[PDB]
Structures are given as structure tokens and as C-alpha cells.
Paper text:
Here, we focus on the ectoine hydroxylase, the enzyme that forms (4S,5S)-2-methyl-5-hydroxy-1,4,5,6-tetrahydropyrimidine-4-carboxylic acid from the precursor ectoine through a region-selective and stereospecific hydroxylation reaction. The EctD-mediated hydroxylation of (4S)-ectoine to (4S,5S)-5-hydroxyectoine requires O2 and 2-oxoglutarate as co-substrates, thereby forming CO2, succinate, and 5-hydroxyectoine. The catalytically critical iron is coordinated by the side chains of a conserved H×D/E…H motive, the so-called 2-His-1-carboxylate facial triad.
In addition, the crystal structure of the EctD protein from the salt tolerant moderate halophile V. salexigens in its iron-free form was solved, thereby allowing for the first time an assessment of the structural consequences of the binding of the active-site iron on the overall fold of the ectoine hydroxylase. However, after analyzing the iron content of this strongly overproduced EctD enzyme preparation, it became apparent that most of the isolated proteins did not contain an iron molecule; the iron content of the EctD protein solution dropped to 0.1–0.2 mole iron per 1 mol of EctD, rendering the enzyme largely inactive. Upon addition of Fe2+ ions prior to the enzyme activity measurements, we observed that the activity returned to levels observed before, indicating that the missing iron catalyst in the purified EctD protein can be restored after the protein has adopted its native cupin barrel fold. The cell constants and the space-group were identical to the structure of the iron-bound EctD, suggesting that the apo-EctD protein crystalized in a manner similar to that found in the iron bound form. After solving the new crystal structure of the EctD protein, it became apparent that the iron ligand was lacking, as evidenced by the missing pronounced electron density that is present in the iron-bound EctD crystal structure. Otherwise, the apo- and the iron-bound forms are almost identical, as indicated by the RMSD value of 0.34 Å over 280 Cα atoms. In the V. salexigens EctD protein, the iron ligand is bound via interaction with two histidine side-chains, His-146 and His-248, and the side-chain of Asp-148. Interestingly, in the apo-structure of EctD, two water molecules populate the iron-binding site formed by the 2-His-1-carboxylate facial triad. This keeps the side chains of the His-146, His-248 and Asp-148 in an orientation very similar to that observed in the iron-bound EctD crystal structure. Hence, the EctD apo-protein exists in a form that is pre-set to incorporate the iron catalyst.
Numbering used by the authors:
A (entry chain A), B (entry chain A): 2 to 195, 211 to 296
Amino acid sequence: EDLYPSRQNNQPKILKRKDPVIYTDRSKDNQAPITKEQLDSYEKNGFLQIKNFFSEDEVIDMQKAIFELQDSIKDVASDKVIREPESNDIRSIFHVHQDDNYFQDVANDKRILDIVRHLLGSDVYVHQSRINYKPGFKGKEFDWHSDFETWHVEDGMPRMRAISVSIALSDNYSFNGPLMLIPGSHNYFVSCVGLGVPDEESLRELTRIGGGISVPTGKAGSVTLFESNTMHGSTSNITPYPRNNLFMVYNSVKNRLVEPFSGGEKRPEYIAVREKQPVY
Amino acid sequence: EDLYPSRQNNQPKILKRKDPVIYTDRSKDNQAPITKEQLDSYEKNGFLQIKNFFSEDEVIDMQKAIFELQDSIKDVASDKVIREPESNDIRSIFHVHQDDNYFQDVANDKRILDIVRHLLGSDVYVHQSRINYKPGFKGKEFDWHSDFETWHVEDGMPRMRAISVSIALSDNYSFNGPLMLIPGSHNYFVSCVGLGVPDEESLRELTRIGGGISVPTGKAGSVTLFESNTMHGSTSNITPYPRNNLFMVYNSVKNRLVEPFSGGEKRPEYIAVREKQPVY
């Protein structure tokens, strides 16, 4: 049963969300690790920024850890390690939540799990992880998209029951190509043409409904959580201020991947997790 | 005598500014139409934003006027009128300060003249004017540059004694590709390689000296004045919020153009004014 068909024709359409946003009853706000106000802001906007999530030592430790890993894998040949063609410089590393002990501990951090389990109303597992290295002046624009539309079409994610967690590992300014989100857009599924980038008309409609464009900013260490279907994008960075980050996607154990809704072949494990965690 | 050589080799260098910034004595701040604080902010940063420069009716009148002119010239064949190749839609119109009565009155507005004459310490004339039409989702990134470096090399402007005046005719947000400036950068001349875009190393050095990147924002009608040599640029606009503007450059009558410092041919009048205004 495909509740969110996309890329099946050349006519875009906006379909209504058929899933809860916050899956734990609001009568149980007292059990959450965040406030009623934070819960309401997530429900309404489709994302939540939390500043001072980590202590200053934890921030510095994480920043050192990404560059220590980058140096440690300089000679590695792996499809998980994305390199710039000309320099061979490492731009991204996938699947660190599983492959490295330090990043596994970050991915299992109770402060993160307590939130995502509350919001998703179940236990969770990591769908994907990635470290991004984005030096000053690097990283092209990313057109607006819903992660969900890709997870669904290409990876077989059935329902809107996953949350992305972005840890800023550089200071996040308005001017260096920050993540931008359309508030409220998680309530609307944009079918895309027969890739996965919505048309301008749909984007205008979402922006009108949301009242604008949201651009969280903050010091290194700040955390942005965003719902699976929240529309987001970024401009290029023409400034010397980098944009390094650690990205993890938490999916409900009740929403495990099936075959790609496109009818196509599975993507690699490092892109979309199909491991079911063993008893031992 | 070339005080600011550029594009003559392939080694960039930073040369010191050899001209005043504010050409009227600071002992005469009382004669200016702006405050000591505004004067100091211009001197330090190389730009000044003024919100509520125009009354609300004047803002609405100017917005209507750009689109009335755009419609009036739909069938025109002119090198002053810049059109998108595919749609033929009008993206810019040069030389309105001279060619249209309404835009001439804007260019002669006493509120603008009183400021630029104070800052340039002399009478002024308009070097260039342009209306830009930048609908939602349109207008590519503009790499960092100093207008002065172009005016000098290509148009024969001798010294740093011109000011650009940008009137926002759309709301100016942080997220839709606003003008960004490097504060303090007007004090440093970046020679460019043998076009006119400075190298990353120089840009890092300016940004370090300035302490960051400045991005004025404000409602339609807000005015940004910037010194001839202030480094500025913008990202692309991936949002539906337009960026229409009226841009005028005021040059001191003591700094009239000579032959291009490149040794090349003059550009057209609509790009760089060489008319000396007649007595009648």
C-alpha cells in the first residue's frame, strides 16, 4: 500500500500527511525530556533547534574527533568515504554510527534518544549517519527537498515516522549556506515528477502556508532536529566560515524499510539501514 | 599615475587605501544630515544602512514605477535593457537616472545628495544607474568584488571617491540572496589577477580584519550606501521572495573618469558616465 506516491507522473500534487507528528499522546507531555513549548514548536514547525545541548568540552571533543577520523582514513578505499575528484579530499563519511566506537556513543546518546523516542512514540534505530566536512568556500547549493520523499521512493520507508538530527560542528551563521527549512511543511507531501526535487509552484504554496522561511543559527554544538518530511535546502557558501556537521537519522522500529516504492533495487546499507539489531 | 594597479600580473596583493573615506572634516559633523554615530559607522565599516529613509507612500510609488517602466518598454530594442535569453523577460534597465523623469527625480533626491556630498566632500554626478528585477528563485550568485577595482581598471576611475546607493524595492531578508559586505574592507585594495574577482586568500584576510561578514536586512525602502571599494557579494536566491532594487552610483566631480587603467577601450555611456553636465 503506497500512501505517498511520487515520481509516477509529470504532474505535481500536494497530498495531506496521513501520520501523526508527535506520536506520544500530548496528555503525556510530563514524560518528555523537553517542555510543552518545545513540543508545541516541533509539532507546529516540523523542526526544533536546541542550543547548549552539549557541554563545551563535548563540543570540542566532537570537533577533534571528526578531524582525527578524517586523518585516520586518509588512505582508505571505501564507497562510504566521499572524496572530491580533483584533490581527493574527504567531504563525507557514511555509517560512522556503526563503524566507529566514538560515533556510536554519540548516536546512542541518551539526551538524543530520549527526545526521538518520545516524538516517534516507540523505540528507534539509526537509518543513516554521516559526517560532512564543508570547508570555507566549499559545498554547492542544495535545492529544496523532503528527505521522506527520497526515503520512501528510493529506500522503502513506509510512513513519516523518522527524525533527522543535525549537530553543528562549526558556528552556524545566516550567511554561510545554513540549513533552511519551510515551517509547517512536514504536514504536506509534495509528489515530485517522474529527481525528487519539488516544483516552484509547490514551494511557493508551502512557503505561503508556513508564513516564511526558517533559518536556525547558533554556535558549534547547537542541535537541529527535523521531521522526515520537512522541506529544507541551502545556498552555497561563498565565505571562509565552514559548515562541518554530524547528521543522524532515527527511524521508529515500527517503520522499518520494505522494498523501494519506486519498484527499483535497494540502495547500499551505508545509505539506508536494513540490519535488524542482533540479540547479543 | 596608477595608484591602484590591478590585473597586470598573476600574483594578488593587498595595497593600502591612499584616499580619505570621509572627505569632509570631522570637525564639520554638525553640517552633515546624519549623526556622528552614523558617520563613524560608515567610516569604520565602509557602508551605512538607513531604514525608514523614504515614507510609505514613496516606497509604494517607487515599486509601482519600476513595474510601470518595465511594462512600457516591453517592445524596446536597446542595449540598456538586459533580457533573459530564453523568456525575453527584462532583468535590468541601465541609465534611468537620465532617461526617465521619475527616476531622475529619485537620483536627485536631496536626502540622498546631502549625504553623498558630505561624505565625498564635493559636488557629485551619477556614474551609473540601474533597476534590477530579480523575481523569486532568480538571479545567480555574485562572487565577491570591489566595484572600485572594475571602475578603475575598466572605466578609468582614478581614486576611491564614489559611493553606491542601493534602494531595496523588495523586503530584504537574510535568506534570499541579500547583499553581503566585508566590514572595513574599503581600507584595502585587492589587486586581482590578469576577471576582477579577488582570490580566497585575500578574502580570508579581509574577513579576519573585519571581524566577520555584514548582511543588512530590512523592509522595502531601506537604503544601503557603500563606499566604492567595499568588498561585496551575494548568494543565489532559492526562495520565492524577490529582490528588486534601484542602484545608483554617485561620483565626486573631482574624480571624473579618464582612460581605462587597463589601457583598453571605454565602455558605453550606460555603464560608465563620461557626460559633463551642460550649463543649460
